[PDB]
Design a protein around this ligand. Structure first.
Ligand SMILES: CCc1nn(CCOCCOCCOC)c(CC)c1NC(=O)c1ccn2c1CCc1cnc(Nc3ccc(N4CCN(C(=O)COC)CC4)cc3OC)nc1-2
Length: 254
């Protein structure tokens, strides 16, 4: 119920996240300030894994100044057994909140989409394709949305629902546009595009079969309907680019 990271001592309040060999805590510094610490455990970490983590941290740290739609990382300590990462404490990850939330105020959802693009666009500039975006990857801070991770590090929920067809036979920035697509879709018709389907092989075949009409129910926002149709184009060159998505009317026009 208390840790030290580069000497400084943080008092845990609760555990606000967990995965792989990693806990995330909500904590207080000396000046009674709040943070999130991600403890990562390395005692079972193979070499490539150990690099993957060093890489992912390298980058998280870097693209701090290149954008505020990326979770802040204030400090880290790193040794052969553990990594501790001192980030800002968000309110909730997107995915938890989408679950609880009734329907989403159109203005909020568009605002959020703008941050998904700002964030993701940043990492593509730097060579990174995330190639595994789900709601879980984004954290609401001060009603603003930030990318947490860059999919660079290895693992220790399986989920095919956000997966772009061109990687249902195995890298492009277009892969992330699909996933962001499914995230927006989720935020729009309250489901992912291939959720109804339960047979995960029937599903995997649905995502690649151009014979499969993806439905996009009529909604007031014709701006928004376009963007979904545009992001969910099974051919990666058919698909809309992110610099295109940032000038799109849905995100551009009042
Ligand atoms: C921890 C397992 C994991 N592995 N990876 C992959 C890479 O990391 C492992 C390798 O090491 C490299 C480091 O990568 C950064 C990721 C990315 C999504 C995850 N998830 C996270 O890192 C991860 C998940 C959440 N966080 C983080 C990091 C920073 C943070 C700040 N703030 C928050 N805030 C927050 C998040 C969640 C919540 N709860 C929990 C969810 N809600 C519930 O419904 C309760 O049920 C569990 C209630 C709200 C409350 C919060 O505020 C107090 N959350 C996180």
């Amino acid at each position: 119920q208390s840790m030290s990271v580069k000497g400084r001592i943080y008092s845990i309040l609760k555990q606000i996240g967990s995965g792989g060999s990693s806990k995330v805590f909500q904590v207080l510094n000396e000046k009674k300030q709040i943070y999130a610490i991600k403890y990562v455990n390395l005692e079972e970490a193979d070499n490539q894994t150990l690099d993957s983590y060093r890489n992912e941290i390298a980058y998280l740290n870097k693209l701090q100044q290149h954008s505020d739609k990326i979770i802040r990382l204030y400090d880290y300590e790193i040794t052969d057994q553990y990594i501790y990462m001192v980030m800002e404490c968000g309110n909730i990850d997107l995915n938890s909140w989408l679950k609880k939330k009734k329907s989403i105020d159109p203005w909020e959802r568009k605002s959020y989409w703008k941050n998904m693009l700002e964030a993701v666009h940043t990492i593509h500039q730097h060579g990174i394709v995330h190639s595994d975006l789900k709601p879980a990857n984004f954290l609401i801070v001060d009603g603003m949305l930030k990318l947490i991770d860059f999919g660079i590090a290895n693992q220790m929920v399986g989920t095919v629902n956000y997966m772009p067809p061109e990687a249902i036979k195995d890298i492009s920035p277009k892969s992330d546009v699909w996933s962001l697509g499914c995230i927006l879709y989720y935020m729009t018709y309250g489901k992912t595009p291939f959720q109804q389907i339960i047979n995960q092989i029937s599903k995997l075949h649905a995502i690649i079969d151009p014979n499969h009409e993806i439905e996009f129910p009529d909604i007031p926002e014709k701006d928004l309907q376009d963007v979904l149709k545009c992001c969910l184009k099974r051919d990666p060159k058919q698909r809309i680019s992110i610099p295109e998505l940032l000038a799109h009317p849905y995100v551009q026009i009042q």
